[model samples]
Target: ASCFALISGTANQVKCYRFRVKKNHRHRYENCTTTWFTVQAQILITFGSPSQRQDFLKHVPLPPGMNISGFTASLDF
Candidate 1:
């Protein structure tokens, strides 16, 4: 789980990334879901993991000229 903050002179765009993780010997599942939003020149991103109740944090780069305010990340099951 990871979150990011982004600031821009123009409207902020939403981005998402998806990855699959192995859940069992015969099955692989998508274990993470991320959502991003920008408001009042600030961006907020949240990550949710159902299997893990812990949160992972990461800083991701946005488009140039964008100023980031803050970010938060968490996991849920």
Candidate 2:
């Protein structure tokens, strides 16, 4: 299990969620396939203003994959 936290204080806070590696692996092209693995996430933000929370909540739709290790978001938002 792992925990993650982000803090924002500027105009709007964007919150993105995604998965991370639990174990290491070496792969060959033939050994790779599209499969979904489960990851446990814990949010650890205890003190964020209402606006910050709203901003973070606005952008949370990124999916999980090898290119996208967990969750990632464009700062443009």
Candidate 3:
């Protein structure tokens, strides 16, 4: 996979995960479970070619302090 993200189903309940590193270093993972995430933006970008996509994302606009630094989207659309 060129890139991958792990997603778990509906966080109907709590969950825990453990990990260990070198020399008995161990800890449990923690975080908020996102049942959903929504976006409200002035511009929703879709491109005709990869080149266009790259060009636009580079200049994608936002408010004075808000910037287009992160994104998650489907390419198949």
Candidate 4:
């Protein structure tokens, strides 16, 4: 687990998050035809120079668990 400030400023800022698992081919206990994943997220922001409050969320659906070592996101601005 790790997060980085990709872009930082007064008017706007961006935050990045990354997570991953070890082992190249050890987490494939499930069959290839019956597995999937999604990113469940919620975001809250104080818009207009920290004046107004707003919230958002997304259920980003993804295909079957591919052979990936890591994932990252920079979704704040």
Highest TM-score: give the candidate number: 1
Give one digit per residue, the lDDT tens place, for model 4 in 1-77: 12211112222111111111112211321111112223322122212211111111112112232222222344675
Q: Please tell me which predicted candidate would have the highest lDDT against the true structure.
A: 1
User: In model 4, how large is the Cα lDDT of residue 52?
Assistant: 15
For model 3, residues 1-77, the per-residue Cα lDDT tens digits are 11112322222211111011111221111122233434322222233444544554344322243323323456573
Give the per-residue lDDT of model 1 (tens digit) for 1-77: 45433333333332221211122211222132343334323334333442222222132334465454544555675
What is candidate 4's local distance difference test score?
A: 0.20
**Residue 36, candidate 1: alpha-carbon lDDT:** 34
TM-score of each: 0.27, 0.24, 0.26, 0.14
lDDT, candidate 3, residue 72? 42
Instruction: Give the clashing pairs for model 4.
Output: none
lDDT of every predicted structure (CA atoms): 0.33, 0.26, 0.28, 0.20
Clashes of 3: 0
Model 2: which residue pairs collide?
18-70, 18-71, 19-70
Model 2 misplaced regions, further than 4 Å = 1-41, 62-77
Error of 2 at 76 (Å): 39
| Runs of candidate 4 exceeding 4 Å displacement | 1-39, 49-77
Q: Using alpha carbons, what is the TM-score of model 1?
A: 0.27
